[PDB]
Tab-separated table of C-alpha atoms in Angstrom:
chain	number	residue	atom	x	y	z
A	1	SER	CA	-0.279	-0.441	-0.145
A	2	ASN	CA	1.173	3.372	-0.699
A	3	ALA	CA	-1.012	5.092	2.212
A	4	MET	CA	1.163	5.794	5.578
A	5	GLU	CA	-1.006	5.096	8.995
A	6	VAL	CA	-2.416	8.371	9.955
A	7	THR	CA	-4.609	8.697	12.986
A	8	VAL	CA	-6.696	11.804	13.714
A	9	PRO	CA	-10.428	12.109	14.325
A	10	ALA	CA	-12.657	12.856	11.668
A	11	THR	CA	-14.722	14.966	13.348
A	12	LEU	CA	-13.267	16.867	16.352
A	13	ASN	CA	-16.322	19.116	18.430
A	14	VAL	CA	-14.597	21.803	20.674
A	15	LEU	CA	-15.904	24.430	23.349
A	16	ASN	CA	-15.747	27.827	22.137
A	17	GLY	CA	-12.895	29.377	24.037
A	18	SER	CA	-10.808	26.256	24.927
A	19	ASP	CA	-7.907	25.479	23.634
A	20	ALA	CA	-8.052	22.588	21.306
A	21	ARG	CA	-5.466	20.104	20.457
A	22	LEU	CA	-5.910	18.552	16.977
A	23	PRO	CA	-3.922	14.909	17.721
A	24	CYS	CA	-2.182	13.241	14.879
A	25	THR	CA	0.087	10.386	14.791
A	26	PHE	CA	1.636	8.137	12.015
A	27	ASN	CA	3.206	5.114	11.898
A	28	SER	CA	6.591	4.304	10.188
A	29	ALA	CA	9.585	1.597	10.098
A	30	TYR	CA	12.100	3.954	9.785
A	31	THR	CA	13.402	6.559	12.316
A	32	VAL	CA	12.445	9.918	11.860
A	33	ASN	CA	15.188	12.106	10.666
A	34	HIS	CA	14.750	15.673	11.584
A	35	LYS	CA	16.810	16.434	8.329
A	36	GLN	CA	14.534	14.424	5.545
A	37	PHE	CA	10.910	14.944	7.731
A	38	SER	CA	8.601	16.849	6.086
A	39	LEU	CA	5.381	17.704	7.383
A	40	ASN	CA	2.496	20.082	5.784
A	41	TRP	CA	-0.551	21.358	7.774
A	42	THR	CA	-3.302	23.028	6.050
A	43	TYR	CA	-6.735	25.046	6.771
A	44	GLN	CA	-9.473	25.392	4.207
A	45	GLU	CA	-13.010	27.498	5.391
A	46	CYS	CA	-14.751	25.168	3.137
A	47	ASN	CA	-14.727	22.410	0.356
A	48	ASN	CA	-14.416	25.176	-2.553
A	49	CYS	CA	-12.055	27.413	-0.606
A	50	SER	CA	-8.449	27.387	-0.985
A	51	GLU	CA	-5.890	25.545	1.209
A	52	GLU	CA	-4.006	27.455	3.449
A	53	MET	CA	-0.623	26.174	5.179
A	54	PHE	CA	-0.150	27.453	8.607
A	55	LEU	CA	2.551	24.944	9.580
A	56	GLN	CA	5.412	23.530	8.242
A	57	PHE	CA	8.151	21.099	9.389
A	58	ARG	CA	11.110	21.782	6.927
A	59	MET	CA	14.675	20.535	9.534
A	60	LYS	CA	12.527	22.087	12.150
A	61	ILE	CA	9.013	23.533	12.797
A	62	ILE	CA	7.859	26.616	11.230
A	63	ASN	CA	4.675	28.241	12.143
A	64	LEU	CA	3.904	30.484	9.333
A	65	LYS	CA	1.549	32.532	11.465
A	66	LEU	CA	-1.604	32.684	9.518
A	67	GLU	CA	-3.224	35.392	9.882
A	68	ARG	CA	-6.657	33.993	10.670
A	69	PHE	CA	-5.077	32.234	13.970
A	70	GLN	CA	-3.188	35.215	15.048
A	71	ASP	CA	-0.503	33.855	17.085
A	72	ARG	CA	-2.810	31.220	18.471
A	73	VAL	CA	-1.274	28.214	16.339
A	74	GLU	CA	1.526	26.233	18.244
A	75	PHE	CA	3.065	22.742	17.651
A	76	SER	CA	1.709	20.037	19.979
A	77	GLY	CA	3.355	17.285	19.500
A	78	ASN	CA	7.036	15.185	18.736
A	79	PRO	CA	8.204	14.171	15.187
A	80	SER	CA	10.539	11.345	16.678
A	81	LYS	CA	7.753	10.296	18.799
A	82	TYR	CA	5.876	9.840	15.259
A	83	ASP	CA	2.643	12.796	17.051
A	84	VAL	CA	2.852	16.116	14.686
A	85	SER	CA	-0.520	17.050	16.609
A	86	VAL	CA	-0.787	20.912	16.536
A	87	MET	CA	-2.381	22.974	19.134
A	88	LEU	CA	-5.133	26.596	18.725
A	89	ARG	CA	-5.440	28.276	21.653
A	90	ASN	CA	-8.579	30.319	22.527
A	91	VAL	CA	-10.566	28.944	20.146
A	92	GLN	CA	-12.983	31.321	17.927
A	93	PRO	CA	-16.127	30.100	15.667
A	94	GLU	CA	-13.988	30.923	12.699
A	95	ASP	CA	-11.484	28.347	13.427
A	96	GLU	CA	-14.185	25.804	12.163
A	97	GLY	CA	-13.029	24.128	9.034
A	98	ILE	CA	-10.834	21.553	7.277
A	99	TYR	CA	-7.629	20.282	8.536
A	100	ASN	CA	-5.245	18.635	6.390
A	101	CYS	CA	-1.980	16.908	7.544
A	102	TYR	CA	0.556	15.958	5.335
A	103	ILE	CA	3.633	14.161	6.216
A	104	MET	CA	6.368	12.107	4.165
A	105	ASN	CA	9.517	10.548	6.730
A	106	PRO	CA	12.576	9.443	4.335
A	107	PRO	CA	13.563	6.660	3.160
A	108	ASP	CA	9.298	5.343	4.193
A	109	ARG	CA	7.560	5.315	0.704
A	110	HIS	CA	4.460	5.982	2.458
A	111	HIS	CA	2.348	9.019	2.182
A	112	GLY	CA	0.330	10.037	5.082
A	113	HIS	CA	-2.606	12.469	4.956
A	114	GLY	CA	-5.068	12.953	7.600
A	115	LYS	CA	-8.014	15.147	7.812
A	116	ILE	CA	-10.121	16.599	10.792
A	117	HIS	CA	-13.288	18.124	10.514
A	118	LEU	CA	-13.376	21.476	13.743
A	119	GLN	CA	-16.257	22.264	14.951
A	120	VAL	CA	-17.240	24.969	17.303
A	121	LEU	CA	-19.811	24.485	19.849
A	122	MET	CA	-21.435	27.172	22.068
A	123	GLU	CA	-19.622	27.440	25.390
A	124	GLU	CA	-23.226	27.698	27.890
A	125	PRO	CA	-25.560	25.113	25.266
A	126	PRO	CA	-28.959	25.136	26.693
A	127	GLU	CA	-29.372	22.358	29.766
C-alpha cells in the first residue's frame, strides 16, 4: 500500500474559547530524521475554498503565522515520537473548518494524509 497509517479524529468538536489539540500520529518503520522529515498542515474554510498552509516542518517547525489564527497556533507534538499534533489556543467560531496534515518520513515510501473536521460548539448550550 502507498498510504502511511495516520490517526486523526475525522470530526473534532471543541467548545468556543477552549484550547483545542488537533491530534495526529503516524506509523513508520523508520526513525524520524529531522534532516529529511516533512510535514505540512493546512486549513480550508470550505470545500470550495483554498487550502492555506499554517505550519510546516523543514529541518525544524516553521509556524507560518496564518493571520486568521493570530498567534494562537502552536506545535503540540514531537516528530521523533511519531506525533505531529497541533494546538489552537482560545478557539473562536471562525476556526471551524477542514484541517489537513500531510506527512513524509524518508526513506519510507508511504505518504501520509490526515483530515480533521473541526467544529466549534457553544460555551454554554441550553441545558
